[PDB]
Automatic annotation (TrEMBL), chain B:
It comes from the Viruses. It comes from Agrobacterium phage Milano. This is Tail sheath protein.
From TrEMBL, chains D, E, F, G, H:
This is Virion-associated protein.
Amino acid sequence: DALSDGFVRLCIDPSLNFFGEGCKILVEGQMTDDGSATPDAVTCVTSELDIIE
Amino acid sequence: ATGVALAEFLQQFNGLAVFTKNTNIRTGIIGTNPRLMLGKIRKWAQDNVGTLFSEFDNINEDIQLLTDFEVQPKCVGQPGIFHLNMRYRPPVRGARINVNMAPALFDNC
Amino acid sequence: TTYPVLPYLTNAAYGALSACSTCNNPELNIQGQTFGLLSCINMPESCTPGWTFGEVTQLQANGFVVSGPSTTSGQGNYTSPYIYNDVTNYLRDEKNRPNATFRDASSRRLAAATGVALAEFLQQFNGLAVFTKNTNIRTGIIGTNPRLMLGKIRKWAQDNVGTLFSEFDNINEDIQLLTDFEVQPKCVGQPGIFHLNMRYRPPVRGARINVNMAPAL
Amino acid sequence: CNKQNGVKNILITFTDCDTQEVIGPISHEQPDDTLPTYKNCAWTNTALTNGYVQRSASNATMTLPVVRDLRVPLAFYQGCAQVDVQVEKFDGTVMTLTEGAVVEPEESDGRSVTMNIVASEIDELLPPGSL
Amino acid sequence: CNKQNGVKNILITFTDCDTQEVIGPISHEQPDDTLPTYKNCAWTNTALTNGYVQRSASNATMTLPVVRDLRVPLAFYQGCAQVDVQVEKFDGTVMTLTEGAVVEPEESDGRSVTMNIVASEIDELLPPGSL
Amino acid sequence: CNKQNGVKNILITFTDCDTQEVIGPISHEQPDDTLPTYKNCAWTNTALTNGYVQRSASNATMTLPVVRDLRVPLAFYQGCAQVDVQVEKFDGTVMTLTEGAVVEPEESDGRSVTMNIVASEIDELLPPGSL
Amino acid sequence: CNKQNGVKNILITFTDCDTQEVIGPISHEQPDDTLPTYKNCAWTNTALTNGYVQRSASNATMTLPVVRDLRVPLAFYQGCAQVDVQVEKFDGTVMTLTEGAVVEPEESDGRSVTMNIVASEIDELLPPGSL
Amino acid sequence: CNKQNGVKNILITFTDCDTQEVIGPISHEQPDDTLPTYKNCAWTNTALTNGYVQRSASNATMTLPVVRDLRVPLAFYQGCAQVDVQVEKFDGTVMTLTEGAVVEPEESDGRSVTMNIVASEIDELLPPGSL
Amino acid sequence: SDDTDWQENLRDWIRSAWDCSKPQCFGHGYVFNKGTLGQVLADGDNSAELSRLALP
């Protein structure tokens, strides 16, 4: 599509960080048994969607 | 459309001489360096405001042009390769006015 | 395997263009929509493009020139081919070692041009009375010594940055000039013989840009 | 090496008018110590009364003392060609300008030129960290 | 000391026009030994005949030669932003000026700017003790 | 050499007005270090508004300070004769101009003349190799 | 044996630019105990206010006193020939200069000549072991 | 014995401004019996009338005669690299200077270099016991 | 067509056409989904390459 040459390579992706992780915070609290995270282990959270499960 | 437009704009750097690590293009060379390329790209971007992009939010940290020599680990980069990171927003439309209608029987000019 | 054109036709067109554009300009690659365009080879259009992209990049990596159609379209007319990655078949050097120095043929043309230019420069030292011991050119005579020859060679290599070489890093040891009375063992050297060791780095150009645009919430 | 006021890089890209051929971006050099001058605002204020202002319309302007390249005809520096200019100083600021127009040519001995360029807007790059 | 004619502090507060973002008050420094100059009286006289005067209306004027900050766009110093200026001399006088308007821009090389600011009135502070 | 900004040769050919006798091309020499100055573009721009330009028509201009030849009348250098000028600088450029017209005469002591010549177009030679 | 500050070799190569003939590289000799001086940085800073500085372009210069060779016309030593100089001190340093140009000739008695050469850049050899 | 006016240590750190490589801090040696001189007050007054004075801003300068190191190019001493100097006298006083810039270079014979450095501020160490 | 699996194959095609590996041939697909409310809300997903048309 006039991009064939191979000089420029597009990567259109709405989920791309540019500014490093930055400003690490840690939230400590109790959870229920419905969750799927191993208790007593620090994990990373990326959005507010998967937090429920 | 913005993907295709940026891809056609960036064709002017194909085969152009690039000067990294000295950024002092001598008198007569037809080269460039990452800062001048970043300026030109950022001007293209804020030139398409209204047709491809919204106004912006902070164009200083939205457009980044890094060289491959400073992205990959040491003694892994290749000469000529770049990395252009752009974060944009399509043109916004409409508003969300909040009317607060209220009469006033008294008068005090 | 399903190439429509007679192969020697496109091969000769590519070779002619390469001998045709870079002769007075041994720097530009025959590559891209504008320069690496085979004008009068004509293919019928088809969107099954011979090599798949996996095979295309597999060939790109193993030193092979790849060609595609300059414009695709279902049942259109005749479209001219177009070459990618004007490189040569150099994957490794003697003793088998990665080294992508002679990867693109422009580096080969440019190595030849640099050799010829250095040879044309050094022609002045033919007959230039040379002093190796005592290093002190007496007054009036037209001699020279190893250090002054090294200095002049270094200055030639210096003011050619940007047109033949790159941003030299340790020119203090990228260029060496030795007399023959030292390289060769004792009682073997010959007066008037020199050894020059240089390490040149051809200029850098544009290549992939890797745009990574991403809209925000 | 910051804290040096001076111009480091000048790229000028010529576009002939009758043939639409692009030349450059060639580097360039200054004839003396005088630096190029800029003006980016579009409207120019003018005092009116006790505190108020009358706003007029104007250009983004640039003044570029440069040394003529010998491979480019002199007329290209004197309004017979469109110019695209890019100046990078030693503190990191980059001023780019595109679709220039050499607006008031003048006699030049053949080596040093002073281009008065007008454009819609001039872009500023503002070394990292900004407000 | 209090016996030295010279400028000590220069605070400038920029207000963006199309976003109303306030920036500052950033300090600033002089490019050379020339000082900022002032004029407070709004009405300006003009001689008429044997002893009388014809009175005209004008603005409170200020001339401020300053060194551009590398963090602020150049266009902010050339009439594309509202300014609030505050200059404190060595003998104790303090001249504040708010809602200014850079009235006459001019080409600048990128470091030294000369702002001509007009306001409704300039306030003067007059070191302690005054008649 | 080819690294010296300076004038090397100046040829002037005089054509008498009322006899059409051609004289020259006599060489000539400079009175001081000031060089002849040029302007080739016929159309001259002028700034209009936000980014646009208003284009006017003009002549190809040349300013030539020269030392009068003692064999040629002074009036030939002051608009009483047609001139053909050809100037060759040290770096290889050659500017030729034919059917000139000395446009603005001025008092000269008898040795040094400053001719202001206007023509339809000036030709430039541009040392070998050019874009 | 280091710590012997002094000049050991001088080579000059003259190339006229009216006939384009090359003479040299002939060795030369110092007239007195003064040594050649160099200036290699192509830029000159200029004391600005409050620690800043102005970085403008300049030349790489060299002052070279020598004894005129009786086989070369004196006019070659005073700016009628392009010189290529190459000086080597006792401690191994080698300064080479090409495309030279004698900038301001001065009266010479016929034996000693002080050439003030300017060039785009001077090279330095820096005896083994650097940085 | 503390009663000895003289320089004991001189350390110079060269950071080129084109390739951004750092060299040093290397010791250095005095070429003759002269001493480095300083000026620490970043302001300069100027004789005004009736006892007043004009206080303007200026640089903190330092004149430093040293012996060129054979492992360092000469151009690093003539204003082509940023210098961080640190001199320590016999009586304990230590004058440190960073981000300096050789403001006005001069011809050097190749051994002794007199650098005129300017900087924003020089710090003094003042051996134990002050005010 | 209305077979949700055929629509899923079309969606996979357009998605792989909007990829980062090979040069892109950007496109977009138009399918429909007819049924009651619950059936239509169940026939949807996070498919950003199709534009479902809910029909009663």
